[PDB]
Homo-oligomer: 470 residues x 2
């Protein structure tokens, strides 16, 4: 019995009910089994955790819970009271019971209390009653677990939810020692690995934490989360998590991109990883590369589905003729790959452009043959690759599935707009030994990224135009 | 008779029907009168301009046209065939007629042909028939204008839509000379000023273009457009266009932020500007901003109890969004070529602190050091105002407004938090051995796009993400 699935647990615009229902269908299809409702900014889940749902909201939740049951997906209702609950007040604890009990009357049998991203400071009244922040949390979590009839699945998200957050380290944390000792053993605890967004989750980091919390954790995986950086998106495969973790874990619930339709790879490849070693104990089962191909091959089929003039040899050919290919998606994913890694093709373009720039002088004076025919042929290879990015954009912009397009638009627009400008600059580097033109005062580009961008930059890390915005 | 209003004319996720209806209400309330339907990526407007609307799409457009009429707003249906059309083929010109006549059967009496953002290259068959790109455009525009009964309002968007796009300049462009000469005089021409996103639209730039096109243009204003840069948003006032342009113009239609609810300031201040000299002395950008923000505020407390003791945990949700929070948010996301007073100020203070950083990284020059400390503390407090702004907005009852703006407000507060941290660290340099970043997200900020952009020519802070 292993919880594998998705947690809607990020900041910003939550998913709407139609999308949650569609998620359940995808989860079932890929043989996953769990959804955890935890959208940080759905107002009645965290900020206003005290308010009961209205009649309409109640009707929408009942329908959603029914849809989970119909798709053989376990629906886990989480709540996040940690920003302002007075833990020692029994009127507050009753409010929390009332809320959760309203939800069980919607049909829900699984629950969670989340204490992620809050400070350690307690109010005066809670310090009189509890000796540490952990004691207060564990107390109300135990009291709520028991009030709900000790449900088969109840989750707890600690404030120290990753290696780096544990004062002073994982294995001596007083916060986690208390959680391990006092949190009832039927309750499961959530963990995100060594960091908030863990590049790898090694087996020993999980043995280490399993010992102080005294169970195998459920992983809350932020690998594909993109709420922390406006320009980023993650389409690369589930990676850096050994199939050997599966027997050492109670589950994995991935918290992925905000943009719903961008999560085809993230969820599909998680499912391939789980299925690969569903029944192992205490030979190379999962290949990230092969799983990416499986997922992109299957994602492609959705682009032609919504959600006969033929011009002569002399006439204007159809702008719309060419559909999105598999090679376009392999490329898109390599440009928007993983949090600590660009995909092979993007890393390559970046490396070639760095090289062209630092060897730029070779081509700005007057013929040095062997170095020069190297630069020209790498520069032409690079110009062709920039052309593949524009093609990828152009064909996506024409696909029949507009819902997928809109979710990804601003990302694909951004990369193609920047590759177009990079290509232009490489072209200009190759004219320096005969063109007098300079490259480019004030258009959009002087202010790129807005005010945020200016601060970020000051910290430690028949003649077509140039002045095109669109 | 002057067309003033909004054009939904940007790239990306278009507005949905509920939002367009709500726009009409806002337009009416602020005494504007025109909407121009032109969403670049609504598929049947440009890419697939040839396809007729389905029964459902047809029903939705009839409803929307009815709503425009009900709110005393002129609905102008635009279409953009320029990527694909063979101009010389009469089957193609007929397809275009069929499309537009389906739309007039929805109730629409006003139309537009847009040729923005396409190349000048014609196919072989069109060069046999037309001597220039302009001739071909003007021909089908005139043919369509006449077929529809020479309707009162018909617009044309040229390919050379701004000063910088005119080869070789505005006043000698063969493309614009042809447009001025041959485009029927009842048809109106769209223009965006000296540039795509014009900082100013001076009076003479409009006299200059008015003479070669031989009428007063309608302005298509991209001042507040934000489709060209993922991280940007514009909440500052309508600025850089004199009230004296009004008599020299047939209208102004603003193409604003993609995020619907962000356009409260952009549209309200445009309306204040028009009203000021319907028939700079008359209009103050600053005063117009205040008017619009004070009225915008009222929407935040509206959607779309336990009282803790002196000992107990105080409500996280207690403090509502203030007027001072919105003035600050707007100053951080102001205009395309200008930050608002408060953001320019924070930037200037932070630049100063950084370049005088050395003063505090050694030790006996007292007056310069007590200057740095007190400016550094003043700056730390201002970074705190940005976090306040964020946390109160994140608690407001109008969730629709919040969601439209969330990732921008999150981004600024997340960066000010990191800037503040760095200023704190600069003031420990004369005793702390700690380095700034000891990777986590920050090494890869902006993604691959960010790394290319950087190479073109001009509880720990790394560890906490949220």
């Amino acid at each position: 019995r292993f919880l594998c699935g998705v947690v809607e647990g990020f900041y910003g615009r939550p998913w709407v009910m139609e999308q949650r229902k569609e998620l359940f269908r995808r989860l079932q299809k890929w043989e996953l089994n769990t959804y955890l409702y935890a959208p940080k900014d759905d107002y009645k889940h965290r900020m206003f955790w005290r308010e009961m749902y209205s009649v309409e909201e109640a009707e929408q939740l009942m329908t959603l819970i029914s849809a989970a049951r119909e798709y053989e997906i376990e629906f886990i209702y989480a709540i996040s009271p940690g920003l302002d609950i007075t833990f020692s007040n029994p009127k507050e604890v009753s409010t929390l019971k009332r809320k959760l009990d309203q939800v069980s009357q919607f049909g829900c049998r699984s629950f969670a209390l989340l204490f992620d991203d809050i400070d350690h400071n307690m109010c005066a009244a809670d310090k009189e009653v509890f000796s540490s922040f952990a004691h207060a949390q564990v107390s109300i979590t135990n009291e709520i677990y028991q009030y709900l009839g000790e449900p088969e699945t109840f989750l707890f998200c600690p404030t120290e939810y990753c290696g780096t957050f544990c004062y002073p380290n994982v294995s001596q944390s007083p916060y986690l020692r208390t959680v391990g000792e006092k949190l009832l053993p039927g309750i499961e605890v959530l963990w995100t690995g060594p960091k908030v967004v863990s590049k790898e989750i090694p087996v020993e980091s999980i043995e280490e934490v399993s010992k102080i919390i005294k169970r195998a954790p459920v992983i809350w995986d932020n690998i594909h989360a993109n709420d922390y950086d406006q320009k980023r998106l993650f389409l690369g495969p589930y990676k850096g998590r050994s199939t050997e973790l599966i027997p050492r874990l109670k589950g994995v619930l991935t918290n992925p991109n905000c943009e719903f339709e961008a999560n085809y790879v993230a969820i599909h490849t998680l499912a391939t990883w789980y299925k690969s070693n569903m029944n192992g104990v205490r030979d190379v089962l999962y290949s990230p590369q092969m799983a990416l191909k499986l997922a992109l091959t299957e994602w492609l089929q959705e682009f032609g589905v919504p959600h006969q003039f033929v011009p002569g040899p002399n006439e204007k050919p159809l702008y719309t003729a060419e559909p999105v290919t598999l090679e376009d998606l392999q490329l898109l994913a390599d440009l928007f790959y993983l949090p600590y890694e660009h995909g092979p093709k993007g890393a390559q373009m970046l490396r070639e452009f760095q090289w062209l720039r630092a060897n730029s002088s070779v081509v700005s004076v007057n013929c040095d043959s062997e170095k020069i025919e190297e630069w020209r042929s790498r520069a032409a290879k690079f110009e062709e690759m920039c052309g593949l990015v524009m093609g990828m954009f152009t064909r996506l912009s024409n696909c029949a599935n507009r819902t997928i397009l809109y979710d990804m638009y601003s990302y694909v627009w951004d990369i193609k707009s920047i590759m177009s400008m990079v290509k232009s600059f490489v072209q200009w580097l190759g004219c320096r030994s005969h063109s007098s033109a300079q490259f480019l005062d004030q258009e959009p580009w002087a202010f790129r990224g807005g005010l945020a961008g200016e601060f970020q930059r000051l910290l430690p890390i028949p003649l077509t135009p140039t002045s095109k915005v669109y």
